[PDB]
Design a binder for this molecule. Sequence first.
Ligand code: J6T
Length: 230
Amino acid sequence: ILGGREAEAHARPYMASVQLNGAHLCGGVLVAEQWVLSAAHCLEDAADGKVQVLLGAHSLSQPEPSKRLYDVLRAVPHPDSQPDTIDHDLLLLQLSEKATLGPAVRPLPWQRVDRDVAPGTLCDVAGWGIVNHAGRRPDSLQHVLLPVLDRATCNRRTHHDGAITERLMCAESNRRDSCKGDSGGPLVCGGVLEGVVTSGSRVCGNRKKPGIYTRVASYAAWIDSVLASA
Ligand SMILES: N[C@H](CO)c1cccc(-c2cccc(COc3ccccc3CC(=O)O)c2)c1
């Protein structure tokens, strides 16, 4: 997260750290007791290593009573996802067991009504992604409120030139933005999950290259089907 600030500890109980061999790789969102939603590209160059999900965390390195690292029993990338493509970049991770719920661990309700979030709406993005262009990795969870950018503006030749489908949404990227290590994490509007961070053009903090977020509402049928297949 560039241009953000340290989040209040455990104020986002749905926030997950998807990890590879003990290291934070991507953000994730707890959407059900045993399921974490993330981005499919996160596990592309991982196939070998131990994939785990850290729940109830503020600090990545420090002990906290609510912190718990879970093993993943199965990884469900969206069937239409392709590598190094920004479309259908969703991943569902089944935990080893149902997560112990409490004030610091709680699933987030997600948008099921397939209608765009109004442009200008301030939405909260959180993550353990890089906090400056030099690549400084924060130990503690960061967040930033970003305004939603209309698809038309986002799709201009000067911006993402037609790449923003109806299944994607954009947020302003001027200084404040999501960056490397934030994909798979949440974009929350009025307490509801609206988007999942994707890597876009892999450029951060540049107003001409807005942040790209996968609209969860567009994938309601797939998420429901995966969550129902215990
Ligand atoms: N705001 C912009 C566009 O929305 C944005 C948001 C989020 C990430 C990036 C971004 C910037 C540089 C390099 C990478 C490659 O990262 C990975 C590559 C492989 C696995 C995991 C990651 C981690 C990750 O994807 O976060 C991503 C850019």
